[PDB]
Symmetry: C6
Subunit: 192 residues, 6 copies
């Protein structure tokens, strides 16, 4: 996917943000967007094509893949990025609104807005972490037993590249925990 | 697809627009164009290839896929984006026309033009929502029973990635409702 | 395909053109080039691969696809865009020629050149419309009966995505009619 | 392929060139490079994959495709573009050499260099035309009879998309003839 | 993958860095990023598709490929690049922090930060080298014998393009050793 | 692959280089990088997929392709480009080092550095030529007889697009000879 438009706005936010905010944006670009574009999209490229089920039943592989992977991980992480970035866009918009107001004519209202930004980022991060955990856990096993109609009885289905996907799942989990740490540290730094 | 040309014009409109207009444009880029380019096009990439029908009849899969999906959702959303953006282009063109006139030599005629922009955006949005609803509803079921010639009697056909497509259908529906809310809020803000 | 080079020249023409010329260029970019790059190329991506004929004869599918689609629609529209844009390039070149002449040292010769531009645009548009109509009409039916050697007797061949292709055929036809209307309106505006 | 680097140099040549030279460069970009990138590469995309021969012999399709198409047309046209553009690069380099000389410190030596540019362009154009003609003529027939080892006796092989390829072959031939006409006209204009 | 964002930051670091730092960045771009984008990604493109195992057992190829290649080499090198580049980002951020401080109002704290940068680069490099070595060694043999369930007894599996992958493995190993040498030389140059 | 980063540095070298150096860089971009990106990568795109061997033995095609093509030609040429360009990067770095030194505060040390650049370019060119020659010669024959285990006895394997690959092999050989000639001419020009 093409992230150029998002990147320009985020950089604008970087100018009007704290040092730890700059660190968070750098982590976002280098360790989430770049890793997706360069590494992870390829890992999940053949998710359905190489998914194989031991049966002669038409349509069992499709329904079993759908049940095994209701949403693909990469799409989940795309949404995650977009939602953790949106609050920064809100804050940047408020900043530019006040700057344009001054033209017409961090403290105060902007400070409350920055705090709300931090809070929403933290909450969306925790939410996507918990969601991923409940959907899959943090380990994709090679065997998926499926009993979804039209499949007769239970069929064995085999996931492609399970170990590599587990590695990247844990990598992205770690990145999200790091970003949570950065947000908490930013709250501490501003408050005290 | 490449949206660079559309993006430059929309940003130009953003400079000569209200704060809520800037919010609407941001939603358009981040939550429609970026989601399509990064997430949804991949979901619908294997729509026909992985579409499977339980038959030995040549040409049944093609006709059944065509009847099940007269237009693909992603193409529908492309059209939707283009049409909800066109009124902004009209307003921006009127603005630049008046600015070039001044060079030669929001209120008044520009205000009526802005209102017409809002109205057309709202109407096109509602229209595409209702169209999607009547074509598919908001849930793609895995099984599609097809009785279209050359298919003999009724055949079972299985859609690929139905759950993920349902998720994104509802995501885009929500985004469109949000944009409707923004347009209504803009009318309220300007009027009162 | 990459249209960046064409786009820069057309924008240059936009600066030295009438308001309706700017509208025509906007329609060209948004409703022809962008629709092709984002929507239509995908629709026609699997034209030959998913084309299926009910036979065991080697080479029948190739010859039957070739007879059914002598040129693909997308290529036709590419040519159409290029040819309707060329007159604008002629006019822009004449403009820059006269401007460079002035440096060395709309009315008059430039006006006749602009009229010729309009006329050639209209004629090429009508020509491509009539050509598309005689090749295919405006409806692609799912069944194509083919009797071309090596095919034995007549064979049934099934087109992929016929409904979506019909939808886009009619969309592009409508866009071309709109552009004809714009050209006629421009002639009226300049003349009177 | 990516032609950005070539394009910048050619535009530089356009600044230091005659009006007819600007026309020739415009034709080169719009009617050769753009047509290849947007239309023709897709037509020849499935040249070997959809090439089919009526046999059960391993390796007959490969050798027969190789004999039928020693070089692909698109590659021929790439080479053609590069070679007809190289003389312009020579002339531009001579121009910049003399300009840098002046900094240190069309007529004369530059005029002879421009004439040599025109001559080499014309000769390379004629050469590529004649080469294409002797390789294929200007019509690709659907049936290719092949008797190359390992093929047993003569086998029937069927080319993919023959009519569309013939159409584009003739289109590019016409463009090259137009460019020859432009070069001859430029010689006439400069001489008299 | 798209490395544009990383590249801009690294170039910024290049301005505020030693000559040997500039050499290291040049090696990073030319001999790691460019080689991946232009050469290696293609070599590993068909890693799983062309992976073949001599069996009729469903799912044996998937599990055997996963065990043979827990992570793909290209992804390993992507991570390696990102991690060896991160310390440079830290140092550049500290530099810009101090420059913005001066605006508000190599030696000292910046020198210690530069040393820490060098140390982390060296350690991450050694770590990725040792990791690659323990995973695969420096030679990919064509035959991989696999006894992972569901595979019955031990099955023979054949890797695609083993010699070319060995060549590139050794190329990247050499590049990493060169970069280690550069870091050690930089420590020597700064210290003495 | 993406060569933008390499291109910017090489152009920088072009500013601080001789006329023949500018010719060499132009040849590098137009007749090596552009030909690869636009023509050759497509020719070698289906190298392994269309490689066919006359056998029923699992894994024979993989090992036979690996032995026939230890490295692919395109990758060889990528490496060749990178290595013949590296000396120019060295010289440019030395130039910028001295210019930054002057800021702090072709002849002499820069002249020796330029000569070393020329020498390394010539040696790397000769080395890659001889390497290609010993690996393949300058002709790829269609038939490759292979006796590598697991293949039973000797098997016949058929290369895809052998004639076109021979054509491009000879084209690139000619380009490299031309570049050698340019380097020798540059040595002569500087010396005398
Ligand atoms: C924008 C955000 C979009 C989020 C989209 C989430 C789509 C989830 C659809 C699940 C559909 C479903 O069929 O799931 C069934 C499952 C119970 O079936 P099971 O026990 O067999 O699943 C065992 C796991 N197996 C199925 C893989 C075998 O139910 C579940 O897991 C419920 C999972 C709910 C996860 C929600 C995470 C929301 C994050 C919000 C972030 C913003 C705040
Ligand atoms: C700052 C840079 C940090 C780089 C850290 C690199 C860590 C590499 C770890 C490699 C572990 C291989 C384990 C293994 O040989 O696999 C066999 C199995 O092992 C098992 O059964 C379960 C293994 C589960 C391992 C989970 C590791 C989580 C690491 C989180 C680190 C977070 C750092 C911020
Ligand atoms: C530019 C906009 C382009 C819009 C293109 C719309 C193309 C619609 C073609 C439908 C062709 C057709 O064969 O459809 C048949 C259908 C009645 O057959 P059914 O009951 O079995 O369909 C049940 C659903 N199933 C077919 C999936 C099973 O008829 C229908 O749904 C009629 C659906 C009409 C939707 C129109 C939405 C227009 C939005 C305008 C926005 C601007 C204002
Ligand atoms: C501001 C950020 C908001 C993020 C919201 C994330 C919401 C995630 C919801 C996940 C629901 C999983 C349900 C499930 O486990 O699937 C099993 C089934 O469930 C069924 O049968 C039918 C389930 C139908 C669910 C429809 C949800 C529509 C949500 C619209 C939200 C609009 C917000 C503007
Ligand atoms: C640059 C422009 C390039 C234009 C390229 C046009 C290529 C047309 C090649 C047609 C070859 C052919 O085999 O066609 C045979 C056809 C008579 O056979 P049929 O009755 O069975 O065809 C029924 C339709 N079916 C064949 C699909 C079943 O003849 C025809 O349709 C004649 C169609 C002629 C269309 C010409 C449009 C020119 C537009 C110029 C615009 C600039 C001014
Ligand atoms: C300014 C924005 C305008 C948006 C217009 C959206 C129009 C959407 C129309 C959807 C029609 C669905 C018809 C249908 O349900 O399909 C079933 C069948 O129907 C048939 O048998 C034959 C149906 C033939 C329909 C031809 C429609 C041509 C529309 C041209 C409009 C030009 C506007 C400039
Ligand atoms: C840089 C330029 C690169 C040019 C590359 C040209 C490669 C040509 C290789 C031909 C190899 C060959 O096997 O060809 C055999 C052919 C005699 O066999 P045939 O009669 O059965 O061919 C009938 C046609 N069929 C083979 C399709 C059935 O010989 C021929 O056609 C000789 C064709 C010679 C064409 C040369 C054009 C050069 C243009 C130079 C432009 C710059 C000045
Ligand atoms: C300025 C814009 C000019 C646009 C010109 C568009 C021309 C479109 C022609 C379409 C012809 C269709 C013929 C046909 O229906 O196919 C059936 C067959 O026909 C045959 O058997 C042999 C047909 C051979 C036709 C060769 C045409 C060469 C045209 C060169 C024009 C050069 C202009 C500079
Ligand atoms: C961010 C960094 C991400 C690093 C990700 C590393 C993932 C490694 C997962 C290994 C899973 C596994 O199943 O591996 C099993 C293996 C013992 O099984 P085996 O003897 O049959 O393996 C023989 C080789 N064969 C398996 C190919 C046949 O265990 C091993 O090799 C352990 C290998 C551990 C390599 C760790 C390198 C970390 C580099 C950190 C750099 C930053 C500081
Ligand atoms: C500055 C530019 C340097 C360019 C260096 C190019 C070196 C090319 C070497 C080609 C060797 C072919 C060996 C061979 O014919 O294969 C047959 C086997 O051979 C075997 O069994 C095992 C062969 C193992 C060879 C390992 C070579 C490592 C080279 C590291 C060089 C590091 C330089 C910084
Ligand atoms: C960075 C540069 C990277 C260079 C990488 C070179 C990799 C070469 C690996 C060869 C592995 C091998 O298995 O090769 C075996 C071969 C003897 O077997 P054969 O007689 O059956 O080969 C007949 C030809 N057939 C095999 C196609 C049938 O040995 C040979 O050809 C030895 C070929 C050695 C070529 C070295 C060129 C280095 C250029 C350095 C440039 C910088 C200075
Ligand atoms: C400045 C622009 C120069 C353009 C030069 C274009 C040359 C095109 C030559 C086409 C030859 C076709 C030969 C043929 O019909 O194929 C049949 C066979 O022929 C055979 O058996 C063996 C044929 C071997 C031919 C080797 C040609 C090497 C040419 C090197 C030129 C270097 C120039 C710098």
């Amino acid at each position: 996917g093409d992230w150029s438009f998002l990147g320009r706005l985020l950089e604008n936010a970087q100018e009007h943000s704290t040092v730890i905010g700059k660190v968070w944006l750098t982590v976002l670009f280098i360790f989430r967007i770049l890793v997706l574009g360069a590494a992870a999209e390829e890992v999940w490229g053949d998710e359905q094509s190489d998914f194989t089920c031991n049966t002669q039943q038409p349509g069992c592989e499709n329904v079993c893949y759908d049940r095994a992977f209701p949403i693909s991980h990469v799409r989940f992480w795309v949404l995650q990025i977009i939602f953790v970035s949106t609050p920064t866009l809100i804050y940047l918009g408020h900043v530019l609104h006040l700057v344009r107001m001054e033209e017409k004519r961090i403290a105060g209202a902007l400070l409350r807005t920055y705090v709300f930004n931090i809070i929403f980022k933290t909450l969306f991060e925790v939410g996507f972490i918990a969601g991923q955990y409940f959907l899959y856990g943090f380990q994709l096993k090679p065997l998926y037993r499926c009993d979804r109609w039209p499949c007769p009885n239970t069929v064995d289905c085999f996931i492609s590249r399970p170990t590599e996907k587990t590695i990247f799942i844990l990598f992205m989990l770690a990145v999200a925990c790091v970003s949570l740490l950065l947000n908490v540290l930013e709250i501490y730094h501003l408050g005290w």
